Design a protein around this ligand. Structure first.
Ligand SMILES: *[C@@H]1O[C@H](CO)[C@@H](O)[C@H](O)[C@H]1NC(C)=O
Ligand SMILES: *[C@@H]1O[C@H](CO)[C@@H](O)[C@H](O)[C@H]1NC(C)=O
Ligand SMILES: [Ca+2]
Lengths: 303, 395
């Protein structure tokens, strides 16, 4: 829609191509010691408490489950997952914070889909940061019982008007082969050019965080006889979107360890938010979609 | 003597891990010291005869998550120490009954998540040592024989959940079964005949099975019952004195059920306060009780009716060999027992060869004998009180 920056010089507003954001992500798995392997632990099934086939050993590469496995490219049926320790510390809660750091403002275009192995969490939160982790705001609350976990009324993103809500649709126990996804409905929220300030800003972020509070319980309350059944396991976190270049770039690449806009229209900075050094006669203006189809470039100019 | 190239051994030499490889066949040089062998996440399609013939110390054989379609007769030969055989997540359409030949020390057989089409008669009979059997997630299962679980004298755990079972299989030969997992099937009604011959049963799980009604005296035969899970179903009430003959029942899962909190739950609300907080869930009806936990439901603010015998049994004059009925129309949730002239008491659970108590309370005879003469009393009980009504049966 808005791909070409320059032609024939004549300038137009431009956006970078939609990327698979998990390819350029930095991970923070808090607290220290939550990841399985040190010491080694044997995991049991909720469907069969005696079926304890899988083990996690950090010393062995075949048995290890590091955080990086939540973002790697996967072959047909060969799923790789990050796994947490068993709920051996019960009644003390089994809590984990998975932080997705990009060090760059990224705009979401599709649903944030989290793929869990052997059970989705009973209680979890999805949060976003626009200032590299300084301030945090919630996207959506996930609970089996929304009123018991957060004291919020269970609402569906499907039944919404032109808001932070708690959903129960991604927390129920349906086995280890069925219902593996927890998703943030980006496309449905957008479905409700627009010059609204908060609209584009809502899907914009530098970081994403998953506050995993309570694991899969297998349909019922916790049975103290076998705590090796309770854990977290994430095979994939699919984040789909593009770079925020303020309609001044069509390419976003890895520069100095993180993503950066390949700035056009005589602009500079990570998000092309400032005028370049010799082009500062007019103050920086962000490019606009209006008028269609090319849009206003709003380029920085020199003497 | 040494570790295979496609495998990873351990200092003990006890453990041999051969996971996440493109193996279409089992490695050729597995050491004889091996106690635990891992062969998961591979493309193995067939287990040939005498494959593990020289692994006499092997305790755990992990063949789960593979493409196993055929298992030969002598595939598990020389496995004298084998305790656990994991064959889950394979392409098996038939149970390899011949393959489980001389496995005298086998205690655990996992066959879950397989395209197994049928459980034939006397399957697993060649392994009477078996204590734990997992036949869960059998989506392509079309047939279960009456004698399928025959020969399993020492079985203590059975998992037959997520098999889309519509009617209960014959679990009578499993005389010493202590744990039964039937969750994820389809049983709208739980009958006393459903769990007949399960005297030693301690744990019963019937979750996500669309259970809408539990018949009178259904669990009466389950004397040893310790744990009962009926969570995630369509239950609104439970029959009066359902848990009374269950002297050892201490763990209950009754949550995620649309409980009707009227005079009919009062017996349960008392039972849980005297024998058991987050175990039983909340009232979904009536509107004044909606949201309250059934453990917190107080009988102090309840006005109840004693059992109403709407239709008392009528006197019958019948000839020998004919079918006779003594009706007793009572509220469906009430407790119903019949006092015969000889002095014996019958319930809906009773296995009398001629006289049967139906779920509507009516006493059926099938064929009457000369000895069936006297007074038959319909005894009805509730939380509010009791009611009795007699009838004279002539010839
Ligand atoms: C998760 O993050 C929150 C702040 O958003 C912090 O207060 C909490 O202690 C963290 N929990 C863990 C286990 O790191
Ligand atoms: C049953 O037989 C007795 C006589 O033995 C008679 O008095 C009574 O009315 C009969 N009842 C019915 C329903 O036939
Ligand atoms: Ca992965």
């Amino acid at each position: 829609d808005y791909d070409i920056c320059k032609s024939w010089w004549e300038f137009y507003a431009c956006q970078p191509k939609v990327m698979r954001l998990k390819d350029y992500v930095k991970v923070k798995v808090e607290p220290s010691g939550i990841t399985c392997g040190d010491p080694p632990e044997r995991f049991c099934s909720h469907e069969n408490p005696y079926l304890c086939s899988n083990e996690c050993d950090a010393s062995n590469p075949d048995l290890a489950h590091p955080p990086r496995l939540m973002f790697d490219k996967e072959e047909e049926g060969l799923a790789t997952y990050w796994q947490s320790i068993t709920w051996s510390r019960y009644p003390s809660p089994l809590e984990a914070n998975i932080t997705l750091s990009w060090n760059k403002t990224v705009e979401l275009t599709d649903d944030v889909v989290m793929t869990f192995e052997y059970g989705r969490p009973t209680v979890m939160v999805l949060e976003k940061s626009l200032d590299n982790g300084r301030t945090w705001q919630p996207y959506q609350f996930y609970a089996e019982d929304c009123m018991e976990a957060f004291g919020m009324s269970a609402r569906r993103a499907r039944d919404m008007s032109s808001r932070v809500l708690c959903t129960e649709e991604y927390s129920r126990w349906a086995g280890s082969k069925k219902e593996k996804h927890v998703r943030f409905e980006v496309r449905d929220r957008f479905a409700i050019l627009e010059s609204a300030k908060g609209l584009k800003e809502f899907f914009t972020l530098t970081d994403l965080r998953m506050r995993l509070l309570r694991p899969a319980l297998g349909g019922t309350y916790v049975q103290r006889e076998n705590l090796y059944k309770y854990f977290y396991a994430i095979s994939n976190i699919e984040v789909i979107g593009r770079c925020k270049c303020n309609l001044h770039a069509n390419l976003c690449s890895m520069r100095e360890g993180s993503l950066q806009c390949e700035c056009e229209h005589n602009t500079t900075g990570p998000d092309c938010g400032k005028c370049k050094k010799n082009f500062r006669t007019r103050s920086w203006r962000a490019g606009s979609y209006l008028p269609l189809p090319h849009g206003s470039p709003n380029a920085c100019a020199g003497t | 003597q040494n570790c295979p190239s496609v495998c990873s051994c351990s200092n003990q030499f006890s453990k041999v891990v051969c996971t996440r490889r493109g193996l279409s066949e089992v490695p050729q040089g597995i050491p004889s010291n091996t106690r635990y062998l891992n062969l998961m996440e591979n493309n193995i399609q067939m287990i040939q005869a005498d494959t593990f013939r020289h692994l006499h110390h092997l305790e755990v054989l992990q063949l789960g998550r593979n493409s196993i379609r055929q298992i030969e007769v002598g595939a598990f030969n020389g496995l004298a120490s084998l305790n656990t055989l994991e064959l889950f997540d394979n392409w098996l359409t038939v149970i390899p009954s011949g393959a489980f030949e001389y496995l005298s020390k086998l205690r655990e057989l996992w066959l879950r998540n397989n395209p197994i089409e049928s459980i034939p008669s006397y399957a697993f009979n060649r392994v009477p040592s078996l204590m734990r059997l997992d036949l869960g997630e059998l989506k392509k299962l079309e047939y279960i024989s009456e004698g399928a679980f025959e020969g399993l004298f020492n079985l203590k755990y059975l998992n037959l959940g997520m098999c889309n079972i519509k009617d209960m299989p014959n679990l009578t030969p499993l005389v010493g079964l202590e744990e039964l997992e039937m969750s994820g099937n389809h049983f709208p009604e739980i009958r006393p005949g459903s769990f007949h011959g399960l005297s030693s049963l301690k744990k019963l799980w019937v979750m996500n099975s669309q259970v809408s009604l539990i018949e009178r005296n259904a669990f009466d035969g389950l004397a040893s019952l310790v744990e009962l899970n009926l969570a995630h179903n369509n239950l609104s009430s439970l029959p009066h004195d359902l848990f009374t003959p269950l002297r050892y029942l201490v763990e209950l899962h009754l949550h995620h059920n649309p409980w009707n909190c009227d005079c009919d739950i009062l017996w349960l609300a008392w039972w849980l306060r005297e024998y058991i907080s987050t175990c039983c869930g909340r009232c979904h009806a009536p509107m004044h009780m909606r949201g309250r936990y059934l453990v917190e439901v107080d009988q102090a603010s309840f006005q109840c009716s004693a059992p109403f015998i709407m239709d008392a049994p009528r006197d019958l004059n019948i000839s020998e060999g004919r079918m006779a009925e003594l009706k007793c129309r009572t509220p469906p949730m009430s407790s119903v027992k019949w006092l015969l002239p000889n002095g014996t008491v019958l319930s809906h659970a009773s296995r009398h060869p001629r006289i049967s108590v139906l779920n509507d309370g009516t006493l059926n005879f099938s064929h009457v004998l000369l000895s069936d003469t006297g007074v038959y009393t319909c005894m009805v009980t509730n939380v509010a009180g009791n009611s009795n009504a007699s009838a004279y049966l002539n010839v």
